[model samples]
Structures are given as C-alpha cells and as structure tokens.
Target: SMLDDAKARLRKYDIGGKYSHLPYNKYSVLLPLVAKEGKLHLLFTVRSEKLRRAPGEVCFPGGKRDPTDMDDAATALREAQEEVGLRPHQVEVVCCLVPCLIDTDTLITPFVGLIDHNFQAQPNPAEVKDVFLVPLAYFLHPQVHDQINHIFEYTNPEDGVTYQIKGMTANLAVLVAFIILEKKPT
Candidate 1:
C-alpha cells in the first residue's frame, strides 16, 4: 500500500522535468554476509558528513556512473570498491534487483552478491564515514520496516509548500520487498 502512493506520484512525473536527465545514476550493493550458520546480511553505509549526496542518509555502497566501467553492475562494483575499498573478486555475484528510478532524472540499480564469511572492507574517507552490515533477517523483519518514516523534503519546491514526504528510501525498500516476495528475488 505504501508503494501505491509512490506509484501514483511517479505517474504524475513529466517525461521532461527539469532534472529529467542529470548525472543521475547510482547503485546499491547488497553484499551478502553469510554467518557460520548460513544466515545472511547486507552491508550498508552511513554516508559521511563530508559527502555531498544525502549526507548522513542511510544507503548501501555505490555511486554515480563512471566512464571506466562496462555496464551498470560494473559501475556498482567500481563504486563499491572505491567507496568501501573493496574488490569485486572478493565477493560472489548472486543476482540483481530490478532497477528503480530515484527520480525522473536519476537512474538507480542494485546488485546482490555473496561474500566470503571473512570478507574484509576498507571504507573511503571522502564518501563513507563507516561501514556496517545489517542482517538479512532485518529485511524479512517487520520491525526495521517500521523504523522508516517520511523525510519532510529535500528542498522546498515553492508554492508555500511546507510538509512533504521525500519517499526516496521508502520506495526503494518497498521495491526490494517486492523483488524478494512479489517479483521473485533474482
């Protein structure tokens, strides 16, 4: 039902909005950390206070598209490595979630991968403050979902608009649930 609201607003978007096409691209890498008992977890990041994009916003490891990569996954892996100082070879690619648009102007893709139980990561100082992993059960749990709330607004659009629901994180999380439960995890 939460996604219903997002979908409704998405439909209202103009194909040619102001940021219909900025340097708009990102990736969320779900590095699966399997415990000794085989439980899974996803490595996420708490953005650095120094970073420009979504400073302090909760996000996974990834970044904008680079000219050096072959495709979206490469872009993701590259960003992952740079942001977290990781090497893709250290982790095993599992599958990918359906690409979700951050906005009309920004494209976002997520990659899910399995990492060795002992996989090590080094965080980049410029972009990430610290690296942390949330359990896979966190996703399956209803509690973390409850931790979510509406961001007032990233910026004031005008028209004396006061209250706003950013919905960026909400939409992504819901879409992930859809991928795992509704669309069948890939």
Candidate 2:
C-alpha cells in the first residue's frame, strides 16, 4: 500500500505524539522549490546547534504559529521568506495536508509549496546551519525511505498531560507526517 511505503520510513528513524494538552500549535512549511533544471525539491535547513530545542535537527523552514498571520499557509510563507529570503511572488503555495498534532504539546500543520527556477534564497545565519534541496523524486520513490529501530518518547503538553505513539522512543510522528506530505496524496 502507498501508506505502507510512506510510514515504513520509520525504519530510517526510531521515535515517537499527543493532543488535547496544549494551547499551542506549530506550522511546518515544505518549500518545493525547483532548481535550474525545473525539477522540484524540498528546501530544508540543518539547524545550528545554538538554538533552543531541536538544535542541529533537519527540518523545513517553519516554526510555531504566529498570531499575526492569517493562517498556517501564510505563516509558512512568512517563515520561508524570513529564514531563507525567498520572495513570496516567486513561489506558488500548492496547498496543505490535513493538520496533525505533532506531540502532546503542539498542533502542527504542514504544507507543500511550488517555486520556479528564478526563486532566490537568503538563508539566515542565526538559526539555520545549512540549507539545501532534496529532490521530490527521492521522496516519491518507495526505496528512498528506510526503517530503523522503532522507539517511543513521552511528550508533555502545557497542561501536563502526556501523549504516546505505542512504540519505542523519539520524535517520529512529526517526521512520519513529513514523509506523507513529501509525497502528496494521489
């Protein structure tokens, strides 16, 4: 099944979500920026070890929802432009997936965006370590995703309630949702 190929990516990682515990949410934006060749790619950043949480983590150019934005889409684009210096006019926001809770602590919304070759990037030095493109083909393929030892971790929301993934330990739910968004539903 397509979902199996998609979820099985946990083999490449081992980890662990929650809901109804926090008054907060997150916005994760996947910028499908095309290169000079016109092939789509996901622009991501290797976070610098200096940040607060998830430092040195591999993630898209996004963060928690800002009260100033209209919605998750706008929040994503705003983050992209601020973090990578991407112009809003150069890219078309493809759409979004069903929103999911990242951990027991935060609600996460992920979106896919499309960009042309003329798109410009100005990665911020304070937060992001290095930025690069991961081709869409790699995600669409069943083979590129792998499985590793499954682990589970506990996450406590602001209300002090914990959520579980029923496996080993780590933060896998977010990445799993990521893999699903990496390849849009057909």
Candidate 3:
C-alpha cells in the first residue's frame, strides 16, 4: 500500500527530539493526504483575505502550539478542526518531518496525515476562505518549477487562480513528494 510505503520512507527522515533544545517559538502544520480514485492528493486551505496575517495565502490547516495542546501533532489537529472542520480522530497521522525554522525565531513542524477522500470540508469562513486538493504526483512532475527561496506555484484548475506554496509549507511539500515518489524534481 502507498500509505504503508510512505510511513516507512518518511520515518527515516523524522527528526524527533533532535532539535528540542532550540528556543524558537513552536508551530505545527498538517500535510493532509486524501486518496481519491487510486491517487493521492494533498489538501490545502486558502486563508481568508480578511485576516491580518498572511491573508489569502495558500497553506495547510495548522497554527502555533497552544499551552493546552498535548503535543505538536495535537496543535496541528486542533487547528485543522478549527480552520477546516476536520475532526482530530479523522486524521491518521503518519509521521512528522524535520522541523523548519522561519522568520529567524519560529520553528514549524509539519505532520503528514491521511484523511478520507469522501470527507466534505466545512471550512470556517472566518479563517479559511476556501479548501482544495492537489494531486501529490503534480509536484513530482519535471515541468513544475520552484523559484528562488524554494517557492512553488500552482494554478488551481477549478478556479484558475495561481497560489504560491512558499516558506516552510513549500519545503514540506517538496520533501513529502520526493519521499513518496522517490523521484527528484527537475
């Protein structure tokens, strides 16, 4: 199974507790995967333009760790529920990738999780403007390109709007696609 294969391959790259000593502010994001028609797609959220921070940006459903959250994965799950109505139990968390540092003082942990393809999202319009899926194989295609600073662009077929998958989110996507497909992007 591709899910089993992904779990095995990603486990090797997990950096559990290796950087716990870092003093950066902690955050977590979920790379939600859905198997649709025998192919895997990644779910992303379009931030509401009304939001002050990173409004209208393309990103996964996640946020900074709360004092009440049990762990990094819990932070991701709680935010996913708040932002996209995805219940915590619905996600099958596969593994955590190496945490990425941003803005010099923030550390973002990315968690890969599997969700049901048929699940319909009830996006919270206050935070998430829209939700969409992109084929995991799309990032592995040689024609797709990443610009300086590892920013990748994808034009949504449904809406014809180009979205920038940049920063830590972009890096995590590249790593996940590479790990799953074992193919290097050109």
Candidate 4:
C-alpha cells in the first residue's frame, strides 16, 4: 500500500528534536494528501486577497502556532480545519518533515496527513479564497522542473490558470515526492 509505505518512510526520516533547541518562532503547515483516481494528490489553498501579508499566494493550510495548540502537529490540524473546514478527526496524520527557516525568522514545520478523497472543502472566506489539488507525481516530472530558477509551475485544469509553486512549498513538495516515490526529479 502506498499510504502505508509513505507513512513508514516519512516517520523514519522525520527530524524529531533535531532543531528543538532553536529559538525561532514556530509555525506549522499540513500537506494534505487525498487519493484521487488511485493516485495521490496534494491540496493547496489560495490565501485571501484581503489578508495583510502574502495575500493571493498559494500555500498549504497552515499558520502560526496558537497558544492553546498542544504540539506542532496539533497546530497543523487546527489550521487546516480553520482555513479549509478539514476536521481534525478526518485526517490520518502521517509524520512531520524537516522544518524550514524563513526570512521572517520563523521555523515552519510541515506535517503530512491523509484525507478522504471525497471530502469537499469549505474554505473560510477570510483566510482562503480557493482550494486545489495537484497530483503528487506532478512534482516528480522532469519537464516541470526549472533547474536555473528552481521554480515549479502548474496550470490548474479546473480554472485554466497557472500557479507558481516556489519557496518553501516547492522544496517541501520535492521532498515529499522523493520520499513517497523513492525517486528524484531528473
């Protein structure tokens, strides 16, 4: 089973406590996986244009850690639910990936979780404007990779609009694709 295999691989490679000593502000993101047509897809959200920062950018469902959140994974789950109406109970959390440090001096933790394919998203209007899914295999496509700029772009079939997948999101997708498929983009 690909799901089980992905869980095992991610768990083994998780950088647990390796950067626990770091004193940066912590944030968490959920890499929601939903199986569609027997293939895995990663969910992404378009931030609402009314937001103060990074408005209209595509990203995973996530945000800064809340005071009441129990742990990193909890933060991811809560944000997912708040931004996209993905209930915490509906997800099978797999594992946390290596954290990334952004220019804002924040450490972003990414958690992979499996959700039901049939689950319809109810994106919060204030935080999210649109929701879309990209096949996990898309990241592994050599033709989609831009070697010089290190950017990955995908045009949505639903809306006929292209989205630039870059920065931490691009890096994280590459990492997940490599782990799950046991291969790298050429």
Instruction: Supply candidate 4's per-residue lDDT for 50.
Output: 98
Q: How much does each candidate deviate from the true structure in C-alpha RMSD? A: 11.7, 12.0, 3.1, 2.9
State the displacement of the C-alpha of residue 181, model 3, in Å, after optimal TM-score superposition. 0.6
A best-first ranking of the candidates according to their lDDT comes to 4, 3, 2, 1
3, model 4: CA deviation in Å? 1.7
Better of 1 and 2 by TM-score: 1
The residue-by-residue lDDT of candidate 4 on 63-122, one tens digit each, is 888789888889899999999999877898887788888887889898899997558999
Which 10 successive residues of model 3 have the least lDDT summed?
A: 141-150
Please give the lDDT score at residue 86 for candidate 2: 77
Model 1 per-residue lDDT tens digits across residues 14-106: 232233234665444443443434444446666889877778666767777767767666766787788877776776554455556755766
Q: Provide TM-scores for the models.
A: 0.63, 0.62, 0.87, 0.89
TM-score (C-alpha) between model 2 and the true structure: 0.62
Per-residue lDDT tens digits of candidate 2, residues 13-88? 3221222224665655554545444443456666778999777666677776677977667787888777787777
lDDT against the true structure, per candidate, is 0.54, 0.54, 0.82, 0.85
- Number of colliding residue pairs in each model: 0, 14, 0, 0
Please give the TM-score that candidate 4 achieves against the real structure.
0.89
The C-alpha stretches of model 3 lying farther than 4 A from their native spots are 142-151, 158-161, 183-186
Query: Candidate 2 or 4, higher lDDT?
Result: 4
